């Protein structure tokens, strides 16, 4: 219960202590930054009862940033340079049906990018599940096969069924692929 695995990945650094698959509590992992990066924080990261202590960073001493980080199901809306001046910004776009969460723009400050956004998954609305659970969509308006993250999806029991005594509610919010279905019974 108190050993650790997977020492933190530190960009522009390598580990110079001996690597192993499981680190006992108390083991110290030592990082070194690649030239010409400057280290910030402690060069050693210890395993304390299953959690690592805080890792260092290896940054450009003039505050420049490297390429912006990739994000799942999204991409930047410009050519990715190898080097950005401090205060430069870039922006992201999510793929079709994905929902951007957080600021679409990131900025290079103090040698690191501000937090990029996420692209959250749409939810499948399964015909087969609905059939099996005796439910349908309340608004048969266009053929919505998917909901977007953040959208309410409302179902009804099919003609002649009522909500099963332990069912989820008939209205639920799609979130990052998660849709809770209700069930109805004769």
Residue numbers in the entry: 1045 to 1230
Kindly provide excerpts from the paper associated with this entry:
Complement factor H (FH), a 155-kDa soluble glycoprotein abundant in human plasma, is an important regulator of the complement system, the chief molecular component of innate immunity. FH is a member of the regulators of complement activation (RCA) family that are characterized by possession of repeating compact domains, known as complement control protein modules (CCPs), sushi domains or short consensus repeats. Human FH binds to, and regulates levels of, the first activation-specific cleavage product of complement component C3, C3b. The four FH amino-terminal CCPs (1–4) perform co-factor and C3bBb decay-accelerating activities, while the two carboxyl-terminal CCPs also bind C3b but additionally bind to GAGs.
In this study we describe the crystal structure of the three carboxyl-terminal CCP modules of human FH (CCPs 18–20) at a resolution of 1.8 Å together with analysis of this region in solution by small angle X-ray scattering (SAXS). While the long axes of CCPs 19 and 20 are approximately aligned, with only a ∼32° tilt relative to one another, the long axis of CCP 18 is strongly tilted, by ∼122° with respect to the long axis of CCP 19, and by ∼151° with respect to CCP 20. The short (three-residue) linker between CCPs 19 and 20 (i.e. between the last cysteine of CCP 19 and the first of CCP 20) along with numerous inter-modular contacts imposes an approximately linear rod-like structure on this (GAG/C3b-binding) part of the molecule; the longer (six-residue) 18–19 linker permits a sharp kink to form in the molecule, also stabilized by inter-modular and module-to-linker interactions, but with a smaller inter-modular interface than observed between modules 19 and 20. Atomic distances consistent with hydrogen bond formation are observed between Gln1101 (CCP 18)-Gln1156 (CCP 19); Lys1103 (linker)-Asn1154 (CCP 19); and Lys1103 (linker)-Gln1156 (CCP 19). Furthermore, the surface area buried between CCPs 18 and 19 is only ∼400 Å, compared to almost ∼700 Å for CCPs 19 and 20. Interestingly, though, the experimentally derived scattering curves did not fit well to data back-calculated from the ‘J’-shaped crystal structure (discrepancy χ = 2.4); nor did ab initio low-resolution shape envelopes generated using the program DAMMIF demonstrate the same acute angle between CCPs 18 and 19. The SAXS data were fit well by an ensemble in which the 19–20 linker was fixed (χ = 1.3), but were fit poorly by the ensemble in which the 18–19 linker was fixed (χ = 2.4). Taking these data together, it appears that modules 19 and 20 are rigidly aligned such that their rod-like conformation is independent of the addition of CCP 18 or the presence of ligands.
